[PDB]
């Protein structure tokens with residue numbers, strides 16, 4: 696994991712050109728900073 | 741999402757997503773004009789996936 | 790004076806880059822560097 | 833793969849764009865030293881995905897459009913090398929009505945002065 | 948090699964021509980999801996070298 700040189704902050708909008716990223720980028724309203732599919736994967740094992 | 745392949749060397753570079761696609765198509769031998777002609781179709785297919 | 794401390798690690802230098810609809814950044818200069826890598830092939 | 837030829841797989845042969853490697857002996861091992869290219873000093877510019885002339889769309893090949901505040905130019909993505917946009921820099925495709933953000937522009941024809 | 952740049956070695960980064968990958972965390976592991984291009988609907992034509 697630790698190969699990124701600097702951690703960029705999550706952008707405000709989640710919609711670039713039509714591509715919907717709201718399922719893979721997190722959102723502030725939910726209590727957990729984990730993303731949607733991340734929190735689904737974490738449920739299954 | 742924004743830097744693309746460019747933050748692998750240097751810090752990062754800024755480029756709109758829809759201009760990234762013309763490069764990643766030109767990398768596969770599909771001429772970049774394929775994208776902008778019917779951008780909507782690709783976007784919808786991506787979301788359905 | 791120095792002493793032993795304990796603290797929470799800082800994963801990196803937090804940076805924010807503005808996103809614009811129609812702008813690009815194009816490097817105007819370059820540099821060369823030499824890295825060094827080591828591997829053991831014998832016992 | 834590094835010493836005998838230029839690698840093309842990111843971070844395999846140096847932390848950058850890779851040019852060469854030279855081996856040096858060492859006890860129970862070997863040491864490699866990689867020569868790598870690193871760009872810097874970027875500048876923010878203005879873009880447009882395509883330009884319209886005569887009601888037809890011209891896409892760029894081997895470059896990207898940029899605006900420097902005076903006139904439009906095409907440059908390499910790695911090093912800033914502006915050149916005057918001319919017919920052979922581009923290929924015509926599609927039509928202007930189909931695409932987003934196309935900008936009215938004039939492309940030079942180098943057969944125009946010869947006639 | 949997949950996330951930071953476009954791979955060019957067949958089947959290494961997805962079962963197709965490869966565009967991108969995005970990582971997602973998981974317990975004791977990691978999950979990758981690869982975006983790939985796949986053509987279809989071929990037509991028979993006549994040729995001459």
Ligand SMILES: *[C@@H]1O[C@H](CO)[C@@H](O[C@@H]2O[C@H](CO)[C@@H](O)[C@H](O)[C@H]2NC(C)=O)[C@H](O)[C@H]1NC(C)=O
Nearest residue numbers: 709710711713714715716717718719722731787
């Ligand atoms: C991108 O997809 C997200 C799904 O996460 C959309 O957000 C949902 O939209 C539905 C439709 O009204 C709502 O019922 C949900 O409450 C929304 N949030 C969820 C599911 O977390 C979003 O609308 C899509 N983007 C656009 C531009 O529509």
Ligand SMILES: *[C@@H]1O[C@H](CO)[C@@H](O)[C@H](O)[C@H]1NC(C)=O
Nearest residue numbers: 708711712808809810811933
């Ligand atoms: C994209 O361009 C449109 C059209 O001019 C503009 O309204 C918008 O502010 C730009 N930026 C976006 C959508 O982030």
Ligand SMILES: *[C@@H]1O[C@H](CO)[C@@H](O)[C@H](O)[C@H]1NC(C)=O
Nearest residue numbers: 817818819820821872873912
């Ligand atoms: C690049 O930076 C170097 C410093 O190493 C400087 O000498 C040079 O003038 C700069 N510009 C170019 C085009 O090399």
Ligand SMILES: *[C@@H]1O[C@H](CO)[C@@H](O)[C@H](O)[C@H]1NC(C)=O
Nearest residue numbers: 806807809812875876877878
């Ligand atoms: C360069 O980026 C800065 C912010 O980092 C911005 O204020 C400026 O407008 C950009 N230059 C342009 C768009 O020419």
Ligand SMILES: *[C@@H]1O[C@H](CO)[C@@H](O)[C@H](O)[C@H]1NC(C)=O
Nearest residue numbers: 899900901902903904905914
């Ligand atoms: C844009 O480039 C042209 C061609 O070199 C030059 O004449 C002009 O001065 C440049 N624009 C600015 C604002 O410097």
Ligand SMILES: *[C@@H]1O[C@H](CO)[C@@H](O)[C@H](O)[C@H]1NC(C)=O
Nearest residue numbers: 884886887928934935936937
């Ligand atoms: C120039 O662009 C405008 C809108 O930006 C468009 O209405 C017009 O047809 C284009 N061409 C000319 C010659 O005005």
Ligand SMILES: *[C@@H]1O[C@H](CO)[C@@H](O)[C@H](O)[C@H]1NC(C)=O
Nearest residue numbers: 988989990991992993994995
């Ligand atoms: C396409 O292939 C079919 C058999 O699969 C063949 O009968 C037909 O002639 C081909 N089309 C051509 C050669 O145009």
